[PDB]
Design an enzyme around this catalytic site. Structure first.
Site, PDB file in Angstrom:
ATOM      1  CB  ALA A  12      66.152  41.880 -13.824  1.00 32.93           C
ATOM      2  CD  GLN A  15      63.308  36.009 -11.738  1.00 36.81           C
ATOM      3  OE1 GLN A  15      63.272  34.780 -11.678  1.00 36.81           O
ATOM      4  NE2 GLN A  15      64.188  36.734 -11.056  1.00 36.81           N
ATOM      5  CG  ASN A 206      69.221  44.537  -7.345  1.00 35.48           C
ATOM      6  OD1 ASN A 206      68.058  44.794  -7.040  1.00 35.48           O
ATOM      7  ND2 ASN A 206      69.551  43.476  -8.078  1.00 35.48           N
ATOM      8  CD  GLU A 254      49.044  66.164 -13.741  1.00 38.64           C
ATOM      9  OE1 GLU A 254      48.188  65.407 -14.254  1.00 38.64           O
ATOM     10  OE2 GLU A 254      48.839  66.795 -12.684  1.00 38.64           O
TER      11      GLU A 254
HETATM   12  N1  LIG Z   1      65.731  43.326  -8.490  1.00 38.98           N
HETATM   13  C1  LIG Z   1      66.003  42.271  -9.253  1.00 38.98           C
HETATM   14  N2  LIG Z   1      67.193  42.219  -9.944  1.00 38.98           N
HETATM   15  C2  LIG Z   1      67.478  41.149 -10.717  1.00 38.98           C
HETATM   16  C3  LIG Z   1      66.587  40.091 -10.830  1.00 38.98           C
HETATM   17  N3  LIG Z   1      67.132  39.174 -11.659  1.00 38.98           N
HETATM   18  C4  LIG Z   1      68.337  39.632 -12.074  1.00 38.98           C
HETATM   19  N4  LIG Z   1      68.569  40.846 -11.483  1.00 38.98           N
HETATM   20  C5  LIG Z   1      69.750  41.702 -11.696  1.00 38.98           C
HETATM   21  O1  LIG Z   1      70.123  41.512 -13.046  1.00 38.98           O
HETATM   22  C6  LIG Z   1      71.503  41.267 -13.181  1.00 38.98           C
HETATM   23  C7  LIG Z   1      71.705  40.023 -14.038  1.00 38.98           C
HETATM   24  O2  LIG Z   1      71.146  40.229 -15.316  1.00 38.98           O
HETATM   25  P1  LIG Z   1      69.786  39.508 -15.810  1.00 38.98           P
HETATM   26  O3  LIG Z   1      68.653  40.495 -15.967  1.00 38.98           O
HETATM   27  O4  LIG Z   1      69.388  38.418 -14.842  1.00 38.98           O
HETATM   28  O5  LIG Z   1      70.264  38.861 -17.209  1.00 38.98           O
HETATM   29  P2  LIG Z   1      69.343  38.795 -18.525  1.00 38.98           P
HETATM   30  O6  LIG Z   1      68.552  40.069 -18.716  1.00 38.98           O
HETATM   31  O7  LIG Z   1      68.408  37.616 -18.416  1.00 38.98           O
HETATM   32  O8  LIG Z   1      70.383  38.618 -19.751  1.00 38.98           O
HETATM   33  P3  LIG Z   1      71.384  37.361 -19.958  1.00 38.98           P
HETATM   34  O9  LIG Z   1      72.825  37.797 -19.854  1.00 38.98           O
HETATM   35  O10 LIG Z   1      71.199  36.824 -21.355  1.00 38.98           O
HETATM   36  O11 LIG Z   1      71.088  36.292 -18.933  1.00 38.98           O
HETATM   37  C8  LIG Z   1      72.081  41.121 -11.789  1.00 38.98           C
HETATM   38  O12 LIG Z   1      73.067  42.109 -11.616  1.00 38.98           O
HETATM   39  C9  LIG Z   1      70.948  41.343 -10.816  1.00 38.98           C
HETATM   40  O13 LIG Z   1      71.298  42.369  -9.910  1.00 38.98           O
HETATM   41  C10 LIG Z   1      65.385  40.134 -10.138  1.00 38.98           C
HETATM   42  O14 LIG Z   1      64.577  39.204 -10.224  1.00 38.98           O
HETATM   43  N5  LIG Z   1      65.102  41.231  -9.350  1.00 38.98           N
HETATM   44 MG   LIG Z   2      46.057  65.846 -12.756  1.00 40.01          MG
END
Ligand SMILES: Nc1nc2c(ncn2[C@@H]2O[C@H](COP(=O)(O)OP(=O)(O)OP(=O)(O)O)[C@@H](O)[C@H]2O)c(=O)[nH]1
Ligand SMILES: [Mg+2]
Ligand SMILES: Nc1nc2c(ncn2[C@@H]2O[C@H](COP(=O)(O)OP(=O)(O)OP(=O)(O)O)[C@@H](O)[C@H]2O)c(=O)[nH]1
Ligand SMILES: COc1cc2c(c(OC)c1OC)-c1ccc(OC)c(=O)cc1[C@@H](NC(C)=O)CC2
Ligand SMILES: [Ca+2]
Ligand SMILES: [Ca+2]
Ligand SMILES: [Ca+2]
Ligand SMILES: [Mg+2]
Ligand SMILES: [Mg+2]
Lengths: 440, 69, 426
Positions: A12, A15, A206, A254
Site C-alpha cells: 500500500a 503503491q 479504505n 506550523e
Molecule cells: N488505498 C490502498 N490500500 C491498499 C493498497 N494495497 C494494499 N492496501 C491495503 O493494505 C492491506 C493489505 O496490506 P498490504 O499493505 O498490501 O501488505 P504489505 O504491507 O505488503 O505486507 P505483507 O503482509 O508482507 O504483504 C489491505 O487491507 C488493503 O486495504 C493500495 O494500493 N491502496
Molecule cells: Mg505560514
C-alpha cells in the site's frame, strides 16, 4: 533547506507513493527521466520543490524517498515501470519473503534482516539534507510489512533522529477493499507501538475512499489506482505548502502545532473537495464557500464517522488554486455561525488556514476532473474515535477466543503484547471522551 | 531572565535525550524477549524431533526382538 | 521467487499428482515435451511457482515421485506427461507396502525416506526463496499414508519455517474394500494434525457420490474421481499460479484460514458440477456453498464456518461477484462464526479452466468436517475393539498404545471442532 524524506512501506505505501510522486512530477513539471526544463538551478538550489526533490549535476531531480517492501513484486514494477529511472537503485529496497499478513514477521522475524539496511539508506538521504524537517511514512495497517516493519522503523527512527517530526499516512482496513481476517490485530498492534513515536497520523478508511470513488466519480468498482490517485490529492494538498513558494502556506511545524492539542490526540480527519468527474464538471463551477461547506459534510470524510455527533478541536483548511483571501474569510466566517458545527469549549480559536495559488493537477488518466479551486480540510474531531471503536470491536471478537494468535506467538510474540496494545487503545478511546467533555 | 532562558533550552535538550533512551531501551528488551521466545519455540521443536526419532528407534528395536524364532 | 516443491507418494498420490500436472501444464501452455506453446504472457508470469527453468526454454515440474512398489514408477513414465518429469526425481522401492501403515512409516519406508530427502534437498537448493511443500497422497493405503506422513515430519524437521501443504485422500467403503484402511487413515490423521499447516480433505465418499448421483455415473472409476480432484487442485492453487490484485502465497493462505493450529483440515468444493447430458454468477454462488458440490462428505449446514475462501474463474462482472458473496453470506449468517469478522474472502481470476467459461472453487474450514472424522473413528473403533488385523502392525514393531493415542487425538480434534461450533460472541 527544510527537506522532507518520504518512506513508503509495504504494498500500500509503495503503491500510494507511486501515485504521489507521479503527481508531484506533474505539479512541478518533472519528466519521467527526472529532467526539469523549467529548473535553471542545475545541481542544486534553495527552491521550495527541493524540499522533496534533490538535484544531480546532470539535471536529474531525484525524490527524497525510500521504498521498502519485504517482497519484491510490487517495487519490481517500479524498477521496470515508467518512472524506473526517476529513483536511484539504492532507494528501492526489497527482500525476498513478505511478512505474510503477520505483524510479528514484519516487526521481529523478516523485518530484522532488512531494518539495518533501510536505516542506512535513510541515513544516506539525511546526509544530503541541510535542514531535514521530518519524515513522511506511508503504510497500511493491515499488511504484515505495513504494520510490523513500519512500527520497527518508527521506533528506530526515534532513536537515530530523536524528536524529529514523523508524520504517517495510514490505510485503515475495510472488507470492501481486499482486507484480511487478521488485519484488526495488525492495526491495533501497530497503532499501539507507533502512538508514542508519531506526531501526526493521517488515517484513510479504505471504505470511505471506496465509497467516494464509487459515488462522486461514478466508478462502479474502484481499483487501488482509483483510490491512490484520490489519496494523492490529499497528500499533495498537505505538502504543497512545502514544495511551493508562497506567502500564505502552512509548513509542517506550523501544521502540527495548530492541529494536535495533546500528543496522543494526533489523528486528524481529512476531507477533500471537490471530488467530481469530468461529466459533472462540464458547465459547472463550484465556489470557495461551496467547497468549504463540503468539508464539513460527513459524506466526504476520508474516514467513516459522524463529525456532527462529535466536537471539533482544530481545523486546518488548505486552499489551493484560484482562491482569494476575501472569499476564504467569508466562507470560514459562515462556518463559525453554524451551530451545527460544535467546537470544544477550550478551543476559542480553532482555524488554521492557508492558500497555495498553484492550481490542482490531475493525472492524465485519473478520474478526477481538472478544477481550479480545491480545498483539503484536516480536522481533529472526537468523531474519529468511532473508527477506533469499530476496529477495537473486531479485535475483541477474535481475541476473546484467541483466534489466529498462535501465528503471532510462533514468531516470538507473547499474548501480553496483545492485551497491552488493546489496553492502550482503550485508554485512547477514553482520552477522546475526556477531551470532548465540557470544561468546569 | 538570562538564567531562565537557559534552563529552558537545557531542559528541552533533556526532553529529546530521554525520548531517545526510552525508545532505545524499550526496543532493546522487545527484541531480547522476542529472541528468547522464538529460541524456546525452537528448543521445544528440538525436543519433539528428539522424542519422535527416539520412538521410531524403539519401534525398529521391537521388530528386531520379534524376529527371534 | 516463491517456489513450491511438489511431492507425491503412493499409487493414489501419483495418479492424482500426475493429473494435477496434466491439468496445470495445459493451463500454463506447457506441452508434454516441456515447451511453451501459449498465447497469453500471463501463463508464464508465475511459471516459477511450480516449474524449473531449464536450458533451451524448457520447463520441468518441481515434482518428486515416490512409491515403495516400483511398478507405479513406470506407469507415470508412460503417462501423457510422463517424460516432462525430471528422471532423477523418481525414487522408488522394490517391495510395496501392502496397505500397511507401519511398513511405510517405520520399517520399509524408513529405509527409503533418506533417499527421497536427498532429492528434496536438491530441488530446494535451486529455489530463489522456497515457500513450501505440497504432498499428494492417500490415507488408506500403506505408502502414501505411512511413508507420506513420515516424509512430512522429516521435511518439517529440516525446513521448520516452510509451509507444509497436503492433498490427502481418505478411504471410503464405496471405493475400496481393503479392511485396514480405517487404521491407516486414523494413524495418518494423528500425524497430519501435528505436522501440516493446511490439509485439503479429498474424501473418496464425496467423490463417489458426486460421480454417481450428480454426474450420473453408475460405474465410477478412479479416472472419474480424479477428474474432480484435478479440477479442485487446479482451483485451490489458482492464486498461487496466476497474478492479480491478490499477490498471495501459501503462508498468507494459512495465516487467514487457520484460527487454531490443529484445525487446518479444509473442505474443498467446486462448481459447476454438471452431467454431460444437460450459467450465471448467482448460480455459481449458490451451488458452490451447496453440500452436493463439496469434496468432503460433510454438510456445512450441520456446523459453522470458521473461515472460507472462494475463487471465481473466468471473465465475469466483478460487481456481480461481490454482490452475490454478500447475498450468500447474510442469507447463511448462522453458518459463519460471528467471532471472526469478515471471514469469507473472494479472489477472482480472468483465466477460466479448460472446457468452462466460468468456475468456482471453494475452500472452507468448517466445523462440520467433524462428520468425516466421526465416520473414520466409527470404522476404526469397530476393528480396534476386537484387535482385528492388529498383528499386521505389531509385527512391524508398533504398540497397541500408539493406536489408542492416534484414536484419542482424532477424537479430541472432533471435540475441538465442536467446541468452536458452539462458541458465542458474548
Ligand atoms: N488505498 C490502498 N490500500 C491498499 C493498497 N494495497 C494494499 N492496501 C491495503 O493494505 C492491506 C493489505 O496490506 P498490504 O499493505 O498490501 O501488505 P504489505 O504491507 O505488503 O505486507 P505483507 O503482509 O508482507 O504483504 C489491505 O487491507 C488493503 O486495504 C493500495 O494500493 N491502496
Ligand atoms: Mg505560514
Ligand atoms: N481418488 C482416488 N483414490 C485412489 C486412487 N488410487 C487409489 N486410491 C485410494 O487409495 C486407497 C489405497 O491406497 P493406495 O494409494 O493405493 O496405497 P499406496 O499409497 O500405494 O500404499 P501401498 O499399496 O500399501 O503400497 C484406496 O482406498 C483407494 O480408494 C486414485 O487414483 N484416485
Ligand atoms: C493461495 O492464494 C490465496 C491466498 C489467500 C487467500 C485465498 O483465497 C481467496 C487464496 O486463493 C487460494 C485468502 C483466504 C481467506 C481469508 O479469510 C478467510 C483471508 O482473509 C485471506 C485471503 C487472501 N487475501 C485477500 C484480500 O483475499 C490472502 C490469502
Ligand atoms: Ca532547483
Ligand atoms: Ca537540474
Ligand atoms: Ca474403484
Ligand atoms: Mg505484500
Ligand atoms: Mg503401493
Amino acid at each position: 533547506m527544510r527537506e522532507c524524506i518520504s518512506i513508503h512501506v509495504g504494498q500500500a505505501g509503495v503503491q500510494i507513493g507511486n501515485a504521489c510522486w507521479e503527481l508531484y512530477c506533474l505539479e512541478h513539471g518533472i519528466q519521467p527521466d527526472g529532467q526539469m526544463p523549467s529548473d535553471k538551478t542545475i545541481g542544486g538550489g534553495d527552491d521550495s520543490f527541493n524540499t522533496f526533490f534533490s538535484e544531480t549535476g546532470a539535471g536529474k531531480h531525484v525524490p527524497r524517498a525510500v521504498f521498502v517492501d519485504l517482497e519484491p513484486t510490487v517495487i519490481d514494477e517500479v524498477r521496470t515501470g515508467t518512472y524506473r529511472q526517476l529513483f536511484h537503485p539504492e532507494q528501492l529496497i526489497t527482500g525476498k519473503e513478505d511478512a505474510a499478513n503477520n505483524y510479528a514477521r514484519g516487526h521481529y522475524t523478516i523485518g530484522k534482516e532488512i531494518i539495518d539496511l533501510v536505516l542506512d539508506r535513510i541515513r544516506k538521504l539525511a546526509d544530503q539534507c541541510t535542514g531535514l524537517q521530518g519524515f513522511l511514512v506511508f503504510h497500511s495497517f493491515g499488511g504484515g510489512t505495513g504494520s510490523g516493519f513500519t512500527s520497527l522503523l518508527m521506533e528506530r527512527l526515534s532513536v537515530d533522529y530523536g524528536k524529529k517530526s514523523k508524520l504517517e499516512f495510514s490505510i485503515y482496513p475495510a472488507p470492501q477493499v481486499s482486507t484480511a481476517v487478521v488485519e484488526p490485530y495488525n492495526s491495533i498492534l501497530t497503532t499501539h507501538t507507533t502512538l508514542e513515536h508519531s506526531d501526526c497520523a493521517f488515517m484513510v478508511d479504505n471504505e470511505a475512499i471506496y465509497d467516494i470513488c464509487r459515488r462522486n466519480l461514478d466508478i462502479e468498482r474502484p481499483t487501488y489506482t482509483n483510490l491512490n490517485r484520490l489519496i494523492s490529492q490529499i497528500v499533495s494538498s498537505i505538502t504543497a505548502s512545502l514544495r511551493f513558494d508562497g506567502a500564505l502556506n502552512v509548513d509542517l511545524t506550523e501544521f502540527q502545532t495548530n492541529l494536535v492539542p495533546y500528543p496522543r490526540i494526533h489523528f486528524p480527519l481529512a476531507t477533500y473537495a471537490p471530488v467530481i468527474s469530468a461529466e459533472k464538471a462540464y458547465h459547472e463551477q463550484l465556489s470557495v464557500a461551496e467547497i468549504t461547506n463540503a468539508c464539513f459534510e460527513p459524506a466526504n470524510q476520508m474516514v467513516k464517522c459522524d463529525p456532527r455527533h462529535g466536537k471539533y478541536m482544530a481545523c486546518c483548511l488548505l486552499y489551493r488554486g484560484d482562491v482569494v483571501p476575501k472569499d476564504v474569510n467569508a466562507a470560514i466566517a459562515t462556518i463559525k455561525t453554524k451551530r451545527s458545527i460544535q467546537f470544544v469549549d477550550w478551543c476559542p480559536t480553532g482555524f488554521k488556514v492557508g492558500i497555495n495559488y498553484q492550481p490542482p493537477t490531475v493525472v492524465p488518466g485519473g478520474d478526477l476532473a481538472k478544477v481550479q479551486r480545491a480545498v483539503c480540510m484536516l480536522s481533529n474531531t472526537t468523531a474519529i474515535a468511532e473508527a477506533w471503536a469499530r476496529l477495537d470491536h473486531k479485535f475483541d471478537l477474535m481475541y476473546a477466543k484467541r483466534a489466529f494468535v498462535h501465528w503471532y506467538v510462533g514468531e516470538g510474540m507473547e499474548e501480553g503484547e496483545f492485551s497491552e496494545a488493546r489496553e492502550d487503545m482503550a485508554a485512547l478511546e477514553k482520552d477522546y471522551e475526556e477531551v470532548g467533555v465540557d470544561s468546569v | 531572565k538570562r538564567e531562565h532562558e537557559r534552563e529552558v533550552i537545557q531542559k528541552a535538550i533533556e526532553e529529546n535525550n530521554n525520548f531517545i533512551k526510552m525508545a532505545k531501551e524499550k526496543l532493546a528488551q522487545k527484541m531480547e524477549s522476542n529472541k528468547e521466545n522464538r529460541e524456546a519455540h525452537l528448543a521445544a521443536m528440538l525436543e519433539r524431533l528428539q522424542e519422535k526419532d527416539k520412538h521410531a528407534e524403539e519401534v525398529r528395536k521391537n521388530k528386531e526382538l520379534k524376529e527371534e524364532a | 521467487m516463491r517456489e513450491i516443491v511438489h511431492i507425491q507418494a503412493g499409487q493414489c498420490g501419483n495418479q492424482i499428482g500426475a493429473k494435477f500436472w496434466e491439468v496445470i501444464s495445459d493451463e500454463h501452455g506447457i506441452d508434454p515435451t516441456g515447451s511453451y506453446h501459449g498465447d497469453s504472457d500471463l501463463q508464464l508470469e508465475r511459471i516459477n511457482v511450480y516449474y524449473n527453468e531449464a536450458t533451451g526454454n524448457k520447463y520441468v515440474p518441481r515434482a518428486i515421485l515416490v512409491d515403495l512398489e516400483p511398478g507405479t514408477m513406470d506407469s507415470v513414465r508412460s503417462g501423457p506427461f510422463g517424460q516432462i518429469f525430471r528422471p532423477d526425481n523418481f525414487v522408488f522401492g522394490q517391495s510395496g507396502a501392502g496397505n500397511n501403515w507401519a511398513k511405510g512409516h517405520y520399517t520399509e519406508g524408513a529405509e527409503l525416506v533418506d533417499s527421497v530427502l536427498d532429492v528434496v534437498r536438491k530441488e530446494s537448493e535451486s529455489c530463489d526463496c522456497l515457500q513450501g511443500f505440497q504432498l499428494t497422497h492417500s490415507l488408506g493405503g500403506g505408502t502414501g499414508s505411512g511413508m507420506g506422513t513420515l516424509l512430512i515430519s522429516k521435511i518439517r524437521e529440516e525446513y521448520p519455517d516452510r509451509i507444509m501443504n497436503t492433498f490427502s485422500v481418505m478411504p471410503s467403503p464405496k471405493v475400496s474394500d481393503t479392511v485396514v484402511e480405517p487404521y491407516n487413515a486414523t494413524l495418518s490423521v494423528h500425524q497430519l494434525v501435528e505436522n501440516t499447516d493446511e490439509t485439503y480433505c479429498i474424501d473418496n465418499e464425496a467423490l463417489y457420490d458426486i460421480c454417481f448421483r450428480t454426474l450420473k455415473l453408475t460405474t465410477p472409476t478412479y479416472g472419474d474421481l480424479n477428474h474432480l480432484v484435478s479440477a479442485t487442485m487446479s482451483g485451490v492453487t489458482t492464486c498461487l499460479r496466476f497474478p492479480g490484485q491478490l499477490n498471495a502465497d501459501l503462508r498468507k493462505l494459512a495465516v487467514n484460514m487457520v484460527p487454531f493450529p490443529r484445525l487446518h483440515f479444509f473442505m474443498p468444493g467446486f462448481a459447476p458440477l454438471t452431467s454431460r447430458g444437460s450459467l450465471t454468477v448467482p448460480e455459481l454462488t449458490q451451488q458452490m456453498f451447496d453440500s452436493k458440490n463439496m469434496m468432503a462428505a460433510c454438510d456445512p449446514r450441520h456446523g459453522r464456518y470458521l473461515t472460507v475462501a472462494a475463487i471465481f474463474r473466468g471473465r465475469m462482472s466483478m460487481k456481480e461477484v461481490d454482490e452475490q458473496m454478500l447475498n450468500v453470506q447474510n442469507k447463511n449468517s448462522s453458518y459463519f462464526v460471528e467471532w471472526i469478522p469478515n471471514n469469507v474472502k473472494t479472489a477472482v481470476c480472468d483465466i477460466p479452466p479448460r472446457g468452462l467459461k466460468m468456475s468456482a472453487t471453494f475452500i472452507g474450514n468448517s466445523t462440520a468436517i467433524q462428520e468425516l472424522f466421526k465416520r473414520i473413528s466409527e470404522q476404526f473403533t469397530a476393528m480396534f475393539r476386537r484387535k482385528a488385523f492388529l498383528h499386521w502392525y505389531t509385527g512391524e514393531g508398533m504398540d497397541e498404545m500408539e493406536f489408542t493415542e492416534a484414536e484419542s487425538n482424532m477424537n479430541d480434534l472432533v471435540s475441538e471442532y465442536q467446541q468452536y461450533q458452539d462458541a458465542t460472541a458474548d
